[PDB]
Design a protein around this nucleic acid. Structure first.
Length: 949
RNA sequence: UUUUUUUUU
């Protein structure tokens, strides 16, 4: 089975009869699904929790560590966000003993038994041994719905395969629908059974209101469009639209926010989290608001004392700059901002002052929605559309669920209200329906090949790269029933030894090739037949007065004339009068499966016109497009309406004995004479030479058919006495051979979709000097292995003598072009040396893109070289001399958070280069970069975290 | 006009 879907609610009745000494004891009672998850964690199973609220999963995520600390063993807790894995660090150090943390720069206590890591580091310490993996029991994958990401979903699937069998896995999730085809994949990729627990109905449910502006001075009206019972209320939506109708940027929005906070302050719904969707819009209304003073005296005193004790670590001028003062003023009134263009010390101050209720309004953004939990009372949105990938799209359902989920608090309020704040135009409830309710999202797999995996797998001998592709989740549906495919192959290989070898010497010489001619020609006509009904020109021909040949299990190439064409052009049902033999029977028991009709030449040229052996009766059948063998050229102007008013009238069981109508008799006699008048079927309405079409495929098909008919009309096998038996036996073996071939291909190695891209990348890799022939890593490959990003470009640049001959205060500016991810530009007040190094680096990028595009890869040289985005070179060059921050702030118009982030991101390459400069043997760039690194990190750019020390 | 991660030796 490999995946056990344990029932969420039914099984557990006795949680304390067994397990009477829980490894951890809370201050309240764990509910049913957490009881079941702990019940399965007791027996050393591997649960897959899928819950809503972040505080329901960490009861398991710390009971597993209480068990880990009880046994002296070790556990690795992995979270994707670098800032989310610090408050967890604080809570695990406060709750019990030693918990080490490892991130891009922090290495706090790398010897504990709760190392907290980002998965991109565990993927880096799986390629080597690292001697920690010998001691694990549990690996708590925290947020496992980042597989659906496009730029990091490959890490979780590179990790989940290489993990050995003895290491148990815990997968916390966010209630995705398709949990049973993923836990089954992990269950049968390893050989352990996996239990799935999924919950709904988070406590303290939430009412989704809608606030539309009116009488912005005091009046606030809230319309209910969703309730505690899931019932959609359209009445509120309608009320909103009329409310917008009677009335029919910053000065109005200020009154909108003062009306919202005026109707909110009258009640106790104070701790309100506004979600804005752009940092300029986020700080604009916070600047323009400018008078609330929502804070009393004692909380003002506590805020002031706390804020100076926390800020007084850093030096003097560094605590007096515009943002710090402005933010302190806002906090003094009780207002905060939490966007991504602010210093991390202020994101941290706002979050640590929001978890104790000393701030009342937060103009947060999605980073607060993901990186922390800290539940608040009332969440208010600000818009419906965001700008993700330059398409300025509408917000999709999965996100909304999370922010709405952090609306209710736990036992400090009855429920939680989520207020949407549509202001510009009507809410357009139609898309609100599928966004605000809807199955959250499936679980995809964004697997792709990078150079790092290829190098770190060629480096090792016992692992092959196609192994990783076969074990990949994007191959799971294909490779699901692999044991059944191989068993079918192995049990039909036995069957192959069975059939006798026939003798074709003489009259049977061309029997196999003839066989081939029979199938393909037939297939061709069907393709041509498809090219007949799919055409718009057939759609003009398809009308009353059309005779067709009908071919299905009931009618065997019986000639019919269509009475009418259905008005519904989707399901083409044709009421058509077709001649058939008068039924000389009423009992289905004499009818049985008969001999498989061998194709004779008389059967393979056109359609053998059936001549009824009995009297010429009629039927009127409701025909499909696929049941008609041919569209005949004849135009019989018969009037369908009277024939319908006669057949449908007569088809009363009581009216089966009506006298025939003249139109029916005339149609039957004319059809019968036409049946006699063509020896094997009249010519069809030619697709090209009669319908005036120009598709090449139909012309090749028609000429191939003509050549095959001429060839088939001379076969010698048709005259042999034992033609049918040997022939049918050959048919059976040929089908078995074809299905075996397809079966082996599906089990073969060419099935992998990305294999040609693997070959092309390997070839381009070997064209540079990184891998010898027959796939053995060379020295440049081993250099490019241990690199963070852009390994190829960095190692090629390092090996060449471009950078070697520059100043240490200039190499930082040269490397600043790889990291900024910001709108870029050139400079004016720059030395000459930087100004020629930029063309050299860009020329190297052009060379790399030209060797990339000259191998088979599809990435144009311009799109590859456009990743090089200089424009922080001057700022980093001035910063890495001793120049203080204020001049940097003045210099140019970019928010000082996206600059400080770039500076640590640069200090992590002038530290990931210590590993390659010490391995190639070039100790003078190492001795310049180990200076250029210690001269760049001195102050609030690299200020230590608050809840770290 | 979003967010975003890549230890040690």
């Amino acid at each position: 089975q490999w995946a056990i879907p344990v029932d969420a609610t039914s099984p557990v009745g006795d949680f304390y009869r067994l397990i009477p000494q829980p490894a951890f004891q809370w201050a309240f009672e764990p509910d049913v699904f957490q009881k079941q998850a702990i019940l399965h964690l007791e027996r050393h199973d591997s649960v897959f929790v899928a819950a809503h609220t972040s505080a329901g999963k960490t009861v398991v995520a710390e009971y597993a560590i209480a068990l880990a600390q009880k046994h002296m063993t070790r556990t690795i807790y992995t979270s994707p966000i670098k800032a989310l894995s610090n408050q967890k660090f604080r809570d695990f150090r406060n709750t019990f003993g030693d918990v080490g943390l490892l991130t891009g720069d922090v290495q706090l206590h790398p010897e504990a038994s709760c190392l907290i890591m980002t998965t991109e580091i565990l993927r880096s310490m799986l390629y080597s041994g690292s001697d920690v993996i010998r001691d694990l029991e549990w690996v708590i994958f925290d947020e496992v719905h980042y597989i659906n990401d496009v730029e990091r979903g490959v890490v979780w699937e590179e990790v989940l395969i290489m993990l050995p069998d003895h290491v148990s896995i815990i997968l916390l999730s966010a209630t995705v629908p398709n949990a049973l085809e993923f836990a089954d994949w992990i269950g049968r990729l390893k050989r352990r059974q996996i239990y799935v627990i999924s919950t709904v109905t988070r406590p303290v449910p939430l009412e989704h209101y809608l606030f539309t502006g009116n009488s912005s001075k005091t009046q606030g009206e809230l319309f209910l469009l969703l309730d505690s019972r899931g019932a959609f209320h359209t009445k509120g939506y309608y009320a909103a639209v009329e409310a917008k109708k009677e009335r029919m940027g910053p000065a109005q929005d200020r009154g909108v926010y003062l009306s919202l906070l005026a109707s909110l302050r009258t009640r106790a719904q104070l701790p309100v989290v506004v979600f804005t969707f752009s940092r300029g819009r986020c700080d604009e209304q916070a600047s323009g608001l400018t008078s609330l003073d929502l804070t009393t005296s004692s909380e003002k005193s506590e805020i002031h004392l706390f804020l100076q004790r926390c800020l007084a670590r850093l030096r003097g001028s560094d605590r007096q700059l515009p943002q710090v003062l402005h933010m302190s003023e806002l906090l003094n009134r009780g207002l905060g901002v939490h966007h991504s263009g602010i210093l991390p010390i202020l994101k941290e101050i706002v979050e640590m002052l929001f978890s104790r209720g000393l701030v009342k309004v937060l103009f947060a953004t999605e980073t607060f929605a993901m990186g922390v939990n800290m539940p608040a009372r009332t969440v208010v949105f600000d818009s419906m559309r965001k700008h993700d990938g330059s398409t300025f799209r509408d917000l999709l359902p999965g996100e909304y669920v999370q922010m709405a989920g952090r609306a209710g608090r736990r036992g400090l309020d009855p429920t939680g209200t989520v207020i949407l704040l549509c202001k510009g135009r009507v809410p357009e409830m139609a898309d609100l329906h599928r966004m605000m309710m809807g199955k959250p999202s499936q679980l995809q797999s964004q697997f792709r090949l990078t150079y790092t995996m290829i190098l770190n797998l060629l480096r090792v001998d016992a692992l092959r790269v196609e192994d990783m592709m076969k074990r990949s989740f994007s191959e799971f549906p294909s490779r699901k029933d692999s044991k059944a495919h191989e068993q079918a192959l192995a049990e039909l290989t036995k069957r192959l030894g069975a059939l006798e070898e026939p003798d074709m010497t003489g009259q049977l010489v061309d029997l196999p090739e003839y066989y081939s001619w029979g199938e393909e020609l037939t297939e061709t006509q069907h393709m041509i037949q498809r090219r007949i009904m799919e055409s718009v020109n057939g759609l003009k021909s398809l009308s009353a007065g059309r005779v067709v040949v009908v071919k299905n299990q009931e009618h065997h190439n019986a000639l019919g004339v269509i009475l009418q064409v259905s008005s519904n052009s989707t399901s083409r049902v044709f009421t058509t009068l077709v001649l058939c033999d008068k039924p000389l029977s009423q009992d289905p028991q004499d009818r049985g499966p008969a001999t498989a009709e061998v194709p004779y030449p008389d059967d393979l040229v056109g359609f053998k016109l059936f001549l009824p052996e009995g009297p010429c009766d009629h039927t009127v059948v409701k025909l499909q497009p696929g049941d008609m063998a041919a569209i005949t050229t004849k135009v019989l102007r018969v009037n369908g309406e009277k024939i319908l008013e006669d057949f449908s009238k007569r088809q009363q069981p009581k009216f089966k004995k009506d006298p025939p109508l003249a139109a029916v008799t005339t149609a039957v006699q004319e059809l019968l004479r036409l049946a006699q008048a063509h020896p094997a079927g009249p010519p069809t309405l030619d697709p090209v030479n009669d319908l005036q079409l120009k598709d090449m495929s139909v012309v090749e098909g028609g000429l191939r058919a003509r050549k095959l008919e001429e060839l088939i009309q001379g076969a010698q096998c048709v005259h042999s006495p034992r033609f049918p038996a040997q022939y049918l036996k050959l048919r059976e073996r040929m089908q078995i051979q074809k299905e075996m071939e397809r079966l082996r291909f599906l089990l073969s190695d060419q099935s992998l979709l990305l294999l040609p891209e693997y070959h092309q990348r390997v070839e381009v890799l070997r064209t540079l000097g990184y891998v010898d022939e027959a796939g053995t890593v060379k020295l440049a490959g081993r250099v490019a292995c241990a690199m963070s990003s852009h390994e190829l470009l960095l190692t090629e640049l390092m090996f060449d003598n471009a950078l070697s001959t520059l100043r240490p205060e200039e190499i930082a500016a040269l490397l600043s072009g790889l990291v900024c991810q910001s709108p870029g530009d050139a400079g004016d007040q720059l030395p000459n040396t930087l100004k020629q190094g930029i063309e050299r680096v860009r020329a190297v990028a052009k060379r790399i893109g030209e060797v990339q595009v000259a191998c088979g890869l599809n990435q144009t040289v311009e799109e590859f070289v456009g990743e090089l985005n200089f424009g922080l070179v001057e700022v980093v060059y001035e910063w890495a001399r001793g120049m203080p921050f204020s001049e940097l702030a003045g210099l140019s118009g970019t928010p000082e958070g996206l600059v400080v982030r770039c500076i640590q991101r640069l200090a992590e390459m002038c530290r990931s280069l210590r590993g390659a400069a010490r391995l190639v043997g070039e100790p003078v760039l190492g001795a310049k970069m180990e200076t250029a690194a210690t001269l760049l990190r001195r102050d609030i750019v690299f200020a230590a975290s608050l809840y770290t020390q």
